From a paper:
The structure of the predicted Bin2 BAR was determined by MIRAS using a native crystal and a Se-Met derivative. A dimer was present in the asymmetric unit and the general architecture of the dimer resembled an elongated banana as found for other BAR modules. Each monomer was a coiled-coil, formed by three long, bent helices. Helix 1 comprised amino acids 38 to 88, helix 2 (from 95 to 159) was kinked in two places, at residues Asp119 and Gln131 (labelled as K1 and K2 in Figure 2A), and helix 3 (residues 169 to 238) was disrupted at Pro196 (K3 in Figure 2A). Different conformations for the extended regions of the dimer wings were observed for each monomer in the dimer. Concretely, the region between kinks K2 and K3 (amino acids 131 to 196) showed different conformations in each monomer and this was likely due to crystallographic contacts. The movement can be described as a lateral displacement of helices 2 and 3. This does not affect the curvature defined by the concave face of the dimer, which would be consistent with a scaffolding mechanism for membrane binding, where a defined membrane binding interface is needed. The overall fold of hBin2 BAR was very similar to that of Amph BAR consistent with the high sequence homology with dAmph and hAmph2 (N-BAR sequence identity of 37% and 62%, respectively). The concave face can accommodate a circle of diameter 170 Å, which was slightly smaller than that of Amph due to the way the protomers intersected and the distinct helix kinking. The dimerization interface of hBin2 was smaller than those of dAmph or hAmph2.
Bin2 (also called BRAP1) is a putative membrane remodelling protein whose function is unknown but high levels of mRNA are found in leucocytes and leukaemic cells. The N-BAR domain of Bin2 is positioned within the BAR domain superfamily of membrane remodelling domains alongside the N-BAR domains of amphiphysins and endophilins. One such association occurs in a subgroup of BAR family members that have an additional N-terminal amphipathic helix which inserts in a shallow manner into the bilayer and induces positive curvature, that is consistent with, and stabilized by the BAR domain architecture. These N-BAR domains exert both intrinsic (amphipathic helix) and extrinsic forces (BAR module) on the membrane to promote changes in membrane curvature. Taken together, these data suggest that Bin2 is a bona fide member of the N-BAR protein family that has an important role in leucocyte morphogenesis.
Author numbering:
A (entry chain B): 41 to 238
B (entry chain A): 39 to 238
Amino acid sequence: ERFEQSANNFYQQQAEGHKLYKDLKNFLSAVKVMHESSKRVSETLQEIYSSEWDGHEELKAIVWNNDLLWEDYEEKLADQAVRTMEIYVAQFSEIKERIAKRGRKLVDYDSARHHLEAVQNAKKKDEAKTAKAEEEFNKAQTVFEDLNQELLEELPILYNSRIGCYVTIFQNISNLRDVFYREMSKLNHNLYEVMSKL
Amino acid sequence: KDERFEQSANNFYQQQAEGHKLYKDLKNFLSAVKVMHESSKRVSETLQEIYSSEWDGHEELKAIVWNNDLLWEDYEEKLADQAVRTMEIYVAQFSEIKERIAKRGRKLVDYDSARHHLEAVQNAKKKDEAKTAKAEEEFNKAQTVFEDLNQELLEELPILYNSRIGCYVTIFQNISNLRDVFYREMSKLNHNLYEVMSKL
């Protein structure tokens, strides 16, 4: 009951992180498509503009700086948004497995329970294998107490981390975009001036 | 003669291939804007879903996402009219031109055959005919028909060739002007977003 709804918490958390991660991944790669299409255009432009015409050199530098700006914007997005999501969502495969192993080690603890009520149900009916049962149950309890006690504190910590990570991620994007726009703005002006000189 | 023509025809073929290509990269560019638009919309919808109406900034976020969407849209409509359809009006002039040049090639074939079939008829091999004013009337007509047309094009092609410069200026100044507002509006929204997320 307490778990099943907490695990329930963790799954909605997983599905949500996974939808976000996917959306970010799509965005990155729309940035690459936007980059690509801008590179093609400035090359056609670089071609249709004669090397004799004034500003042909400044045109060369715009095409170049356009590119270094897309590349840099793309790279930083990949680190600061996509990779950060990947670090974040990796936590979910580890936990899915930790919950798989907690489902087992409690089946063991319960059978080493089942087995020690039927080795000790024997006052003088028991032989040698009596402390071997008590040692077993104790190893099955310590195994499950660690995994469950450590799992019981870890899930909610992880659930509560979700907002901080979304916040870090979206400020990182805004910072990158802020700079990218400002820089692109300068080049946009330079582009107009070069053209105005034909 | 058909050699100022050749250079003018060269020039035109460069211009036409240029316009076709720029036209394509401009259309492609607009696709990619739409792809960005889309991808951003999908990002902001997941963010809206995550963002609780029980939270401060929720309404402002609903406006960011909203205006964000009107910007992309406006920008797309305007790139369409000012860059893509501006090129469409421009490259479209190339149909008439290409059909007039293909037509001027036929008429120079009308010329070249006339020159041949006048020269057999006429040439002192003792079978002259009192009335081949008829090979004269035709092959007079062939040359005046081809020379006029050849002439027309020698006037049109440079006028049109040279106009490529204004088109390119126009189109890139349009885009540049458009980008200027778009970056500035996008910046504001990008800040609001930064602020709206830093309250969480």
